[PDB]
Every structure is written in structure tokens, then in C-alpha cells.
Design a protein around this ligand. Sequence first.
Ligand SMILES: Cc1ncnc(C)c1-c1ccc(C[n+]2cc(NC(=O)Nc3cccc(C(F)(F)F)c3)on2)nc1
Ligand SMILES: Cc1ncnc(C)c1-c1ccc(C[n+]2cc(NC(=O)Nc3cccc(C(F)(F)F)c3)on2)nc1
Lengths: 159, 165
Amino acid sequence: DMYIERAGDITWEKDAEVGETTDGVYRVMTRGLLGSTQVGVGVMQEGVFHTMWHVTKGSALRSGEGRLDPYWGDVKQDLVSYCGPWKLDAAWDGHSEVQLLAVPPGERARNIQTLPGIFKTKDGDIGAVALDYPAGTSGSPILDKCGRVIGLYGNGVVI
Amino acid sequence: GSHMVDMYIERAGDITWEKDAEVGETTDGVYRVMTRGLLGSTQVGVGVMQEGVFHTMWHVTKGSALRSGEGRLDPYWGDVKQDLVSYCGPWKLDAAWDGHSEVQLLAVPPGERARNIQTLPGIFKTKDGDIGAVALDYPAGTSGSPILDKCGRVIGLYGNGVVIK
Ligand SMILES: Cc1ncnc(C)c1-c1ccc(C[n+]2cc(NC(=O)Nc3cccc(C(F)(F)F)c3)on2)nc1
Ligand SMILES: Cc1ncnc(C)c1-c1ccc(C[n+]2cc(NC(=O)Nc3cccc(C(F)(F)F)c3)on2)nc1
């Protein structure tokens, strides 16, 4: 039994550290007998819930009273969307600072501004934020200066 | 008010690459740089003893003499821009990152055990220059912790990063 609950708006913050379909950033929760815990984070935008495939593994999600079914995915890229196509088309410019809107398990959302590093791995040269958050923070949106989601926290971006 | 009175080093480990890793006395080794005063003692950074010379970051000591047990280490060389300082002799640490390999941070954090963390350095295209750095975050008194190549050579100190031109 797996569900989402809202955690905040998706905003670029000045003064940062350097079923219901409301736009915003959501905790992805799994419950059982003992109780509930966060498996990841996602982004509601234009009526579509975006998270990482490995967070849900294509499970349906309860959203209050309603139920969200997966619409699309890509296991290689580790992406999955609910209710509609992938709406997050923005991308890192390759030079600017970005903001991780990290939403850790059992803690408040927060913006961290940082410059992405480039990691020259074997598979490819990969851009990633040098910020380390607990497991279940995966799917936290990363924002450009215009407030657009340029990626989700967990994997990084191939160039 | 009250001021700090005594800066000193104490040994924390050998400087080795660990095969099973997370993916005055002048004994070779890695050392905590400690400052004591009235209210107690606090770790202000880390340094490397190699070939009779203690290597740390300028901002850690600011060129103070260091107690090493009973004896005294006086600074021999420094560079404030590069944030480097040596004691008892010239800078011995001449190795550098090869630009492709994984490295190991031998982090020595305040009030915790030494440990090796293996990681691939990232390159950060800052305004001033391109900077290579490990994507590992530790408290400020970890600064001066050696970063190692697979030959066991200190290729850097934790805290600033390395300029690439
Ligand atoms: C990638 C890598 N290769 C080799 N060794 C290491 C240690 C790493 C490494 C480095 C940092 C982190 C911490 N981390 C980052 C994320 N996710 C994320 O950054 N996503 C994202 C997506 C779109 C755009 C961007 C941005 F705009 F910043 F380029 C970033 O998750 N964990 N992990 C692994
Ligand atoms: C550098 C930078 N620019 C812009 N934005 C950010 C967020 C950063 C950024 C990224 C990671 C860290 C964490 N961190 C690393 C170190 N120090 C260190 O890595 N030293 C070192 C010295 C010699 C060789 C090498 C190696 F071989 F790895 F290249 C590394 O201290 N803190 N800080 C800041």
C-alpha cells in the first residue's frame, strides 16, 4: 500500500543555503502494519506526477481518496509518470548554479543552492549536485533560476 | 574575553589505501590538529606527517607553532593563497590526481575515527577556474584530511579542491 502526500510548493528561494493533483512536491510513502515510511519524492506538474521508476516500480499510488495509475516510464533513465506524459522538459544549462529542493524522510523541505559538478565516469560524463541526502530523498526536484524542474535527485544527468 | 592558549597535534592513524573501503614527534601518519583553552579542546583541522615534515592548511594553524607531545614544531613554509603550510621542512607532497581515477579521502573528523572513503572526484566549473573536488561533506575540522591515490600517495588535502588549467 503506497501513497503520496504534499510537502510544499516548487519555488526557487532567494536566501537559500549556498485523487488530489495540486501542483507541488510530494513525499512517496509506503505503509504496512507497523506504520508508514518515505520511499522517495516526486513532482506534481500539469496534472502529472513525476518520480523515479525505482521509487514505485510502477505501483499505483493513492492520493487522498483517489488512485493514480502509471501512464509512462523508462527503466533505463529511471523515470515514471502518473496520469499523463512526462511534462518536465527543462534541462541544466551547463554553467549555472541550481537549487535542490530536498525533501528528506521525516524532515521539512528545503532549498540548497549549489554548482553541479561533472563526474567523468566510464559510462559517460555525468552532471550531479554534490549533496548527499538519506535514502528516500530520491525524486527530489532540482530547479533552475526560473523555477523549472531540470531533474530529479538520485541519478544525475548525462551530457 | 578568553583566548585559545595551545595548539597541538595528536596522531590518528597510518596513511594507507584500504582495499575494503566505502565506495617533537615526527612519526609518519595522519594527525588531528587540536586547540585547547579554558573551556576545553577542539579539533581545528587535520594534517599529514611525511619525511619529517608536517603538512596542513594555512587557515588551520595560521602559521602558529605546534606542540608535538613534549616538543615544538615551527612553521618552515607557507602559501596563504594556496592555503598550505609546512613544519620542520619543505613541502614533500608532490603527487597529483591523474584526472580519471577514483581516489580515497582518509577523513579524520572531530571526535570520530579515521576512515577511508573511495570516490570519483567531480569537476566544478567555477567562475575563478575549473576545480576538482571529492563530493564528500564533513565538518570544518576535517580540513587537511589527505586524499590518496592507489599508490598510497597524498594527492591533496580536504578542504579547498585543486585548480586545473
Ligand atoms: C554521479 C557520480 N558519479 C561518480 N561518482 C559519484 C560520487 C557521483 C555522485 C555525485 C554526487 C551524488 C549526490 N547525488 C546527486 C544526485 N542527483 C542529481 O544530482 N541529479 C541531477 C539531475 C539533473 C540535473 C542535475 C544537475 F543540474 F545538478 F546537473 C542533477 O543524487 N545524488 N551522487 C553521486
Ligand atoms: C569545489 C566546488 N566548487 C563549486 N561548488 C561546489 C559545491 C564545490 C564543492 C564540491 C565538493 C565539496 C566537498 N569538499 C571537497 C573538498 N576538498 C577536496 O576535494 N580536495 C581535493 C584536493 C586535491 C585533490 C582532490 C581530488 F583529487 F579529488 F581532485 C581533492 O572539501 N570539501 N566542496 C565544494
